[PDB]
Structures are given as structure tokens and as C-alpha cells.
Amino acid sequence: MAKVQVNNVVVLDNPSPFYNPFQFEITFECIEDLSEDLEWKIIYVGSAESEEYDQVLDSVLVGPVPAGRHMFVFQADAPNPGLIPDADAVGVTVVLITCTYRGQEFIRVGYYVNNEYTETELRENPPVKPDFSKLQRNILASNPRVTRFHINWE
């Protein structure tokens, strides 16, 4: 009995240098006119070891929402490398997109993000301290994990 349905999320500019902002082309539907706003968030799981290195890259408010199909491009700056533990910098991590209505999250789209060096020299002999200016971020867009939640739509 949900008023909002997310139809598609298109990962734009992918793969890209680590420092490029995230770009997602979100398409959604709205069953009836919404009285409140939809709050979108892009969270970057910096460290798998701990949830305290998760970075909310941006939070966007979309509203008021009339009934019908809508589309928008969510832009969020790249995560702060200063908060990414060295051990978790090169390899597979997760980026999440979460929509919320009236303070309740109803959808969460997760994507595996593979950060890798592009140069053969660095791929064979990587630096002790990760060089974020030489790391390519590749969001594995062909395999998202969508999770829906039961919320109070009133």
C-alpha cells in the first residue's frame, strides 16, 4: 500500500576516477499526491570493519511530489579519503541510496563498488599508502541489491 515506487536507478559516469562525484539517474512513480517530502541519501561504507566509517555523501529533499512519474539526477561528492582506512581503500566496498518518507526509510539500493589502480605498475606493486588520485572507482551497476521496508504511509 506504498505511495512511492522506485522504477529504476541508472549509474552515470561509470567507471570513473575515485574523486569524481557519484551520479545516479533515479526514476520513480508516485501513486497519489504527497503531502510531505522524499529524503534521498547516498551513504558510502568506508570500512567494512566498522559502521562508524560510513559517510553520508549527501542528503537531498524532493518535494512536494505530485502523482505521476518523476526523474532526477542525484549528485554527491566523492567520499573523504581522510576517513577511509588504508586497508579498506583498494578493493570492493558498498555505496547505498536510501529514500525516506516522513522520517521512515522505505527503500535502499546497494551497489558493490570496486576501487582499483589502472596502471600495471601500481597493480603489481601498490603503494603502502593508497594513492586516491590513481584509484578508479567502478560501481558494479549491473547487480544492485534493492531492499524495501514496511513504513506508515497514512
Binding site: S59, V60, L61, G63, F74
Partner: peptide
């Protein structure tokens, strides 16, 4: 403080 698109 949530910007608005």
C-alpha cells in the same frame, strides 16, 4: 544541516 533538488 539536507539540500533540496
Amino acid at each position: 544541516x539536507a539540500r533540496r533538488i
